[PDB]
Amino acid sequence: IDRDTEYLLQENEPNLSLDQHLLEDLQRKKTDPRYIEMQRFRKKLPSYGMQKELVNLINNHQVTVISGETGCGKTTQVTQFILDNYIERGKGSACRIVCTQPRRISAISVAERVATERAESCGNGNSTGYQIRLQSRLPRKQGSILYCTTGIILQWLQSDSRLSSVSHIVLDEIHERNLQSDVLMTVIKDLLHFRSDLKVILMSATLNAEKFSEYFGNCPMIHIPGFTFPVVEYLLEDIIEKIRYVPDQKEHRSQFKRGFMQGHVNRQEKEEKEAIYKERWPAYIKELRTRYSASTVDVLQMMDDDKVDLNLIAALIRYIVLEEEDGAILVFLPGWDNISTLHDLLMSQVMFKSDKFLIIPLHSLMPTVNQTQVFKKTPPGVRKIVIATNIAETSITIDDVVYVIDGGKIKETHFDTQNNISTMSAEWVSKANAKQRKGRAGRVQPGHCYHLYNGLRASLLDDYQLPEILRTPLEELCLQIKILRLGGIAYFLSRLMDPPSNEAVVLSIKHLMELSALDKQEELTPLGVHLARLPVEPHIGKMILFGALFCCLDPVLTIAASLSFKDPFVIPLGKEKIADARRKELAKETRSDHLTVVNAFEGWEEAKRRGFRYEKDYCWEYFLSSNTLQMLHNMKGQFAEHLLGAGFVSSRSPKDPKANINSDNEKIIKAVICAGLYPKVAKIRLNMVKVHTKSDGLVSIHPKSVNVEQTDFHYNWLIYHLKMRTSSIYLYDCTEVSPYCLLFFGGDISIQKDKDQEIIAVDEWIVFQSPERIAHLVKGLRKELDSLLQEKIESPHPVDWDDTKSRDCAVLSAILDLIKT
Numbered sequence: 001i002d003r004d005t006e007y008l009l010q011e012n013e014p015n016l017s018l019d020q021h022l023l024e025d026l027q028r029k030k031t032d033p034r035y036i037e038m039q040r041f042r043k044k045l046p047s048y049g050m051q052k053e054l055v056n057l058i059n060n061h062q063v064t065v066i067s068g069e070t071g072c073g074k075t076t077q078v079t080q081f082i083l084d085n086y087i088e089r090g091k092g093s094a095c096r097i098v099c100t101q102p103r104r105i106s107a108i109s110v111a112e113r114v115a116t117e118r119a120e121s122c123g124n125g126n127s128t129g130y131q132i133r134l135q136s137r138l139p140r141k142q143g144s145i146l147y148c149t150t151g152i153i154l155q156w157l158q159s160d161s162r163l164s165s166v167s168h169i170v171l172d173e174i175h176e177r178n179l180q181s182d183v184l185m186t187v188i189k190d191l192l193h194f195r196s197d198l199k200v201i202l203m204s205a206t207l208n209a210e211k212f213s214e215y216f217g218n219c220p221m222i223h224i225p226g227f228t229f230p231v232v233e234y235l236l237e238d239i240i241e242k243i244r245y246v247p248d249q250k251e252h253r254s255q256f257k258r259g260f261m262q263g264h265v266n267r268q269e270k271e272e273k274e275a276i277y278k279e280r281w282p283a284y285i286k287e288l289r290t291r292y293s294a295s296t297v298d299v300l301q302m303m304d305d306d307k308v309d310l311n312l313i314a315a316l317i318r319y320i321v322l323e324e325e326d327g328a329i330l331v332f333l334p335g336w337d338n339i340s341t342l343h344d345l346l347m348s349q350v351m352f353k354s355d356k357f358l359i360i361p362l363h364s365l366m367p368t369v370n371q372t373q374v375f376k377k378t379p380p381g382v383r384k385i386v387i388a389t390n391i392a393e394t395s396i397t398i399d400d401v402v403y404v405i406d407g408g409k410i411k412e413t414h415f416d417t418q419n420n421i422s423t424m425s426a427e428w429v430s431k432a433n434a435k436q437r438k439g440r441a442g443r444v445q446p447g448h449c450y451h452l453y454n455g456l457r458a459s460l461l462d463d464y465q466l467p468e469i470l471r472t473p474l475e476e477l478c479l480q481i482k483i484l485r486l487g488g489i490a491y492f493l494s495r496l497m498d499p500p501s502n503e504a505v506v507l508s509i510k511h512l513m514e515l516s517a518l519d520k521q522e523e524l525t526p527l528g529v530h531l532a533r534l535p536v537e538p539h540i541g542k543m544i545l546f547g548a549l550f551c552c553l554d555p556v557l558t559i560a561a562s563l564s565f566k567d568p569f570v571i572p573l574g575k576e577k578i579a580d581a582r583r584k585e586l587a588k589e590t591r592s593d594h595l596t597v598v599n600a601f602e603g604w605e606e607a608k609r610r611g612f613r614y615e616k617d618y619c620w621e622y623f624l625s626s627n628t629l630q631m632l633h634n635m636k637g638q639f640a641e642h643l644l645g646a647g648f649v650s651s652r653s654p655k656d657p658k659a660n661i662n663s664d665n666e667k668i669i670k671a672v673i674c675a676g677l678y679p680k681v682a683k684i685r686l687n688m689v690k691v692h693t694k695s696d697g698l699v700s701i702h703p704k705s706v707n708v709e710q711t712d713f714h715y716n717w718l719i720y721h722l723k724m725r726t727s728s729i730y731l732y733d734c735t736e737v738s739p740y741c742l743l744f745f746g747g748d749i750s751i752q753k754d755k756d757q758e759i760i761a762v763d764e765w766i767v768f769q770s771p772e773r774i775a776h777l778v779k780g781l782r783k784e785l786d787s788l789l790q791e792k793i794e795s796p797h798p799v800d801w802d803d804t805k806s807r808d809c810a811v812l813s814a815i816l817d818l819i820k821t
């Protein structure tokens with residue numbers, strides 16, 4: 001059933017006796033010192049001045065766009081303006097306001113900020129609360145504001161597709177162009193025709209907010225103006241000159257291989273622009289030598305385009321602290337790895353270890369609230385340094401920021417449709433992002449923004465980042481569209497504000513079919529309904545889903561985490577060869593790059609029990625990035641409580657013993673890997689080591705692979721996750737599997753005979769010898785599992801592996817028996 005439907009399932013029932021209660025409470029608030037102090041902060045915001053022009057536009061029209069500068073008050077104020085208007089007109093009980101957020105933490109932290117501005121507690125029957133998935137602090141039924149995530153709304157449309165209890169819906173941060181926000185807009189636009197009463201407010205940062213107006217039929221639009229002080233900008237040349245930066249010698253040595261050998265993408269029109277860059281480079285350097293010292297130019301020539309130089313940021317921070325006037329510094333970094341690294345770099349220095357600095361890492365997976373004291377002001381003499389990702393570009397505003405360090409990089413998903421490769425990587429900011437970052441420094445006074453890219457690069461940046469719909473694989477979206485009965489997949493996507501390419505759509509639908517999430521009429525299978533309940537890429541979904549079904553949870557979640565993000569191995573330059581020997585050491589006899597990660601991870605936990613010296617000694621002698629290991633560990637946790645939500649495990653812990661009974665069985669883990677990586681399958685050529693593919697002919701093994709020199713495989717088949725082309729095609733990480741694993745989790749099953757041999761074909765190209773009875777057997781077992789999955793839709797509960805006679809243990813045990821041939 002559904003546990004997060006309670007604010008939605010209450011009926012909107014206005015009550016004049018509550019209309020009076022809310023208005024009397026409104027004037028007792030006016031006497032409360034906590035309340036008046038918060039009101040003095042609110043009147044300073046530009047939104048306050050426009051308070052009633054905004055509410056008149058909202059009240060006269062059904063769809064409204066509100067643009068404004070960042071920090072003007074959109075997220076925290078507009079809901080209050082609506083609610084307080086209805087209160088003041090004695091119509092308070094009629095207000096049920098829903099405000100969608102892009103991230104859980106936003107929903108929570110905003111609800112808590114708003115509740116303290118109303119001088120109330122959050123939830124507990126007061127005016128404001130939040131609902132995220134699995135966790136809520138709900139306000140009262142009527143006259144209330146609810147902060148939720150777009151994910152919640154999408155679940156809500158399963159039980160009430162008209163959202164009839166809700167009076168006003170506010171779509172926040174829509175300029176971020178998240179997938180979910182983009183489809184929600186399209187759903188909402190069609191809803192308007194059936195809900196005369198419903199009011200919709202779209203809230204966007206100023207840039208291109210007209211586009212949303214035009215998608216909605218040229219709805220009214222209103223801009224909240226703000227003032228930003230002028231900001232001095234600096235490119236890399238300027239920073240290098242100002243601080244006379246010199247990279248370290250003894251630090252930089254034994255540099256960490258990447259590009260092809262750690263598996264990067266290098267798409268089509270990045271290379272076209274990068275051909276422009278290397279052609280304009282000599283002329284740019286010669287020019288620079290006229291305006292900058294020789295040493296500045298010598299350093300810049302040597303700068304690495306791939307990584308953010310965290311030592312330069314550390315230097316630059318130190319210069320600002322010592323040479324510039326008071327003011328908080330804000331640092332923009334691509335992701336969590338760099339944030340914690342920079343943090344550790346700073347506080348490895350005795351200067352910053354003082355109480356005259358407040359150094360705050362800030363990111364979306366951060367615990368609790370933003371109550372971390374990001375917002376609190378520093379007394380004179382103490383300097384606040386905030387190290388963040390792009391969520392401080394628009395979602396969050398720190399008022400006292402005066403210096404902004406823009407690392408120049410942002411993490412983007414990307415998807416190449418011609419060779420069918422989906423990557424995530426650090427990419428250059430756009431001009432639009434760079435302009436938003438610069439503005440965070442002009443909020444209270446004249447500021448400074450230091451961009452870590454050179455003049456040549458600045459001129460070649462893209463003007464805007466592309467919406468995720470145009471660069472992200474579409475499989476999760478497509479499951480949402482059918483679970484919501486929105487109709488044809490391709491047809492619906494074509495109606496989006498920015499419709500995806502048709503090849504992206506066809507590739508995603510094919511993938512869901514090969515995964516058995518859709519049948520060949522493009523309709524949900526029992527398995528697909530469960531995959532849609534998981535907020536992960538479906539292939540990762542199927543794998544972690546079966547890791548719970550087959551009771552091998554802990555190693556599966558590890559592999560799933562590494563496929564989702566990346567493996568923990570690093571190769572220092574020149575140390576390639578002995579690093580390969582340690583990798584194949586961890587491989588033991590598995591013939592599996594995936595079980596290597598598992599062995600490396602399991603070794604790491606037992607090593608961290610034995611103390612730092614033995615743990616650091618481990619990551620060193622076996623070449624693991626302990627930073628990477630930690631995030632994988634944390635993704636394991638997330639995957640677990642994903643499973644907890646869908647009802648497949650009874651606990652939030654991945655090492656829970658009841659879900660781990662088969663975790664030491666190599667055959668079974670390999671079956672589960674196969675569940676998620678099919679149809680990427682290769683047939684090994686018998687006695688260079690090369691393998692046949694359905695896609696690409698004869699291909700080779702990537703040299704990082706524990707199977708690259710291997711000639712004693714014990715089965716004929718491999719599965720791989722990542723394939724990449726340079727001069728030819730190479731498989732990155734592969735795992736030898738039995739034909740019986742393919743036969744169960746694979747495509748359509750067919751039988752051939754003639755005179756000589758009994759043959760089973762899977763998807764017609766995968767052909768092995770075995771008796772025809774086994775084919776009828778797997779046909780039967782597949783249908784029994786389908787019904788196990790169907791009947792766990794309506795009341796999901798984890799399989800109990802301690803019950804003998806279950807009819808779920810019976811079928812899965814039979815399936816386990818079959819894949820153990």
Ligand SMILES: Nc1ncnc2c1ncn2[C@@H]1O[C@H](COP(=O)(O)OP(=O)(O)NP(=O)(O)O)[C@@H](O)[C@H]1O
Pocket residue numbers: 045068069070071072073074075076077109113172173203370371375394395396397398399
């Ligand atoms: N948790 C908080 N604690 C203190 N001040 C806050 C908090 N959240 C926001 N503010 C302040 O509230 C003001 C407006 O913030 P906010 O309402 O998010 O503006 P906005 O950028 O227009 N809305 P949005 O960009 O959509 O999130 C700024 O001065 C912020 O510093």
